[PDB]
Nucleic acid binder design. Structure first.
Lengths: 430, 435
DNA sequence: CTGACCTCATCATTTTCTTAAAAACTGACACTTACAATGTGGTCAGTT
DNA sequence: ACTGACCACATTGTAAGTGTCAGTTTTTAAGAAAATGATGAGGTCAG
């Protein structure tokens, strides 16, 4: 349109430099007559010119020029089963929670989180895992990484962190960028080496009391009490609790969280919420002791929330009624059936493939007694359009001589387990 | 036996309390299965299950073909934010259709996460929209996504280093100083005239990265001329380890004179990084954002943070991709622009009558206006009187480190006030004041 | 030999799951009004 | 005489609105089947 055509035509002229600074623009009220355009279009074009500072106008009209110069299957514990997700149950609550009548939920607020969401999480934790909490005690954010970065900023750059050697490669990745340094630790079949911790001047150590990734070892009560006494020995040491994959134990009901024994408020409860409902929904949560929570509130008062308020409201409406328990039970049953079927199928190769670990969880890890190296196993698996993930990446120490490979089955359909196992074993040469 | 918890639980609790109180010592022999089952008239299965759970917990240890052994030794009416958007005008009925379209039973294999840099789609449509609406020239793979501006700025801070010195605008939007208060880096305060940032103070100082808004200046609304933009670009080009960050506040809400092209459009030496937002246009509570980086910084970010995961859910990403794929975003933006223009004209016409004691500083474009109060009363008195009428207001003192003008000037917002309540709110706040 | 490891049988209560009809929803097509964009024309007050 | 901005009413094409409709969908008191905790009676193997 001429509204912008004239503006561009004069902009290219002022840019190329046929007119210098101080020269008047060709005319006013005369260029419209000479170019047979109306005066309004010229006025609008000149207003556009002076808006961006290409030409500046004296309050009495003068014009001053300015410019002058392909995998069939995959196996790993991250995936969860997606077919059995009740979409028709999520959609109902979504349509119930977001309506034109219920406005003013489109604007941000409650930097920590929605009060109802926090209260319901506290109630659920207290009545399920035996974790004493307070509605204002718990904080909620998107992703565990953000919460751990907030923790790192809150504690400082003058601390050393304890990480078990075979475990989840997350704290190492976070501490690589930060100035802090970590100390490796070995683990036996009963838990972490509490003796090594107590004979060392570590400050904060990271562990999963409920289930040990990936071996599934469960800490006994004597080691737990010894660790609490070690934390009580000093005044400025803290223990972080990781709620990786609880509520998924079949035979032996559920084991209470370590915080239940925390009489002297010295445990912070890290958790997770995206390894149950949706892997890509990005909600996590964390509980802190009263003094540390108070200091965090008094220190991080400016940051806004990280997870959308719509998701908070729809999910607290979803699991306020009680569908969370039903979905959890159905997932537990189907995963138990999958585990039993996989174990029964793989039991016949007991002489060469020995299963090690415990039933509870979403994955199993098996040692291969064949003479091929772990690289050969991975290459042959990926050559059959079914890639597998070795355990060597989960520990930074020297490679274990028997090639130990982790296997997951969350993503594999129930009817394709036999075919996947058969083709994997055929690729391995059995 | 009458409790809802089966004997599978009462027996375990009883042995729990017996062990904890110390009635059974270390290594003491348990009565095994048959003896206890006969003594307590309970089936072998429940007793063996309770003992197996006990062994799993670790209180006692079982050895094959022999008995157990213990191993346990001991009110506001009209809120005034220059940050809200109008809520009633939001087309919820259009959001619902896309949400029901994207999340269905057949739409499996999407709950699992992935593509930490964002799905190729959302990136490609956001790049297309940026190129065709703001003159931003960038390949789709360069843009990144995140939950809000805070996470992106923290990632940029970690990627750059702890030695750089950051430059901010005049006393104003208090974000970068709040972020840098927790980091070893330091900020250099600056001053701006009624046109923009003073490039002379930039070139007489050795600052490395300076934060500015080349489109609209918070809160004065000043727009940088081409000469100052070219001078800043030349200063950035002068050295080899200095960068300029661009933050477009409301660059798509210019009423009369179309849209002002972005500063990145004039960049040729790959020296600017774009910082946009999706929380001041569509919904201020979904927490979406984006950032554009040049090729070397893109490679550095890809090779440095390759082992992260996006903080934005794929449901929202896909529904936004569907929303902006068919063009409803432009229609919604036009509707919001028109309603905000009408609101601004109405409020300006209403406030024109009281002009002797009050003045308007900001320009037409934007969502807020700043006005001075020449009445003989201090800023705290204005704030307290406003709050006493159940409608509190926000002064510029919080935005100002120093004291600029002795007559207090207050920022007023109208994004979250209905058209039928503007006159009533203005009348009641004026009555609360001396007028 | 008594003693402790196990794996079938089939009983039971109470949650989960499935199909029927009757209910409300909303989609595409259509059309009737409206509406604010650019745009031409004719002014307006005030400088110097 | 040279030049500020402020009406008039003309235009094309996007946005807004009501209509009935076929259509995918929501809701429900039945129905039946699954699973656990539970009793009973075995199985091998040590020492």
């Amino acid at each position: 349109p001429l509204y912008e055509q004239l503006y561009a035509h004069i902009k290219t002229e002022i840019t190329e430099g046929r007119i210098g600074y101080g020269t008047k623009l060709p005319s006013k009220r005369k260029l419209a007559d000479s170019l047979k355009l109306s005066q309004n279009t010229v006025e609008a074009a000149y207003e556009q010119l002076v808006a961006e500072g290409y030409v500046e106008v004296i309050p009495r009209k003068g014009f001053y020029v300015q410019a002058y110069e392909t995998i069939r299957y995959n196996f790993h514990p991250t995936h969860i089963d997606t077919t059995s997700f009740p979409f028709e149950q999520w959609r109902k609550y979504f349509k119930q929670t977001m309506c034109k009548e219920n406005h003013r939920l489109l604007l941000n607020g409650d930097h920590q989180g929605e009060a109802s969401f926090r209260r319901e999480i506290a109630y659920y934790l207290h009545h399920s895992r035996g974790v004493n909490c307070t509605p204002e005690q718990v904080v909620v954010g998107a992703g565990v990484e953000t919460l751990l970065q907030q923790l790192f900023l809150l504690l400082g750059e003058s601390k050393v962190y304890g990480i078990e050697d075979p475990g989840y490669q997350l704290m190492r990745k976070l501490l690589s960028h930060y100035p802090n340094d970590y100390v490796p630790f070995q683990v036996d079949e009963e838990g972490i080496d509490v003796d090594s911790i107590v004979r060392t001047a570590v400050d904060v150590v990271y562990t999963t009391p409920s289930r040990h990734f990936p071996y599934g070892s469960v800490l006994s009560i004597n080691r737990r009490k010894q660790l609490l006494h070690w934390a009580e020995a000093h005044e400025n040491r803290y223990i972080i609790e990781d709620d990786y994959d609880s509520e998924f134990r079949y035979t032996g009901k559920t084991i209470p969280s370590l915080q239940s024994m925390d009489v002297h408020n010295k445990v912070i409860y890290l958790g997770a919420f995206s390894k149950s409902l949706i892997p890509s929904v990005r909600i996590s949560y964390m509980v802190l002791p009263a003094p540390l929570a108070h200091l965090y509130k008094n220190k991080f008062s400016y940051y806004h929330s990280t997870v959308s308020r719509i998701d908070q409201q729809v999910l607290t409406a979803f699991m306020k009624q009680g569908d969370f328990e039903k979905h959890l039970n159905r997932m537990r049953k189907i995963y138990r059936r999958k585990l039993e079927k996989v174990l029964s199928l793989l039991k016949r190769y007991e002489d060469k493939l020995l299963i090690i670990g415990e039933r509870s969880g979403l994955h199993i890890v098996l040692v291969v007694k064949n003479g091929m190296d772990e690289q050969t196993l991975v290459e042959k698996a990926l050559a059959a359009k079914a890639k597998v993930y070795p355990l060597s990446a989960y520990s930074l120490e020297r490679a274990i001589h028997p090639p130990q490979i982790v296997l997951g089955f969350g993503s594999i359909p129930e009817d394709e387990l036999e075919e996947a196992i058969a083709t994997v074993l055929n690729a391995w040469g059995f």
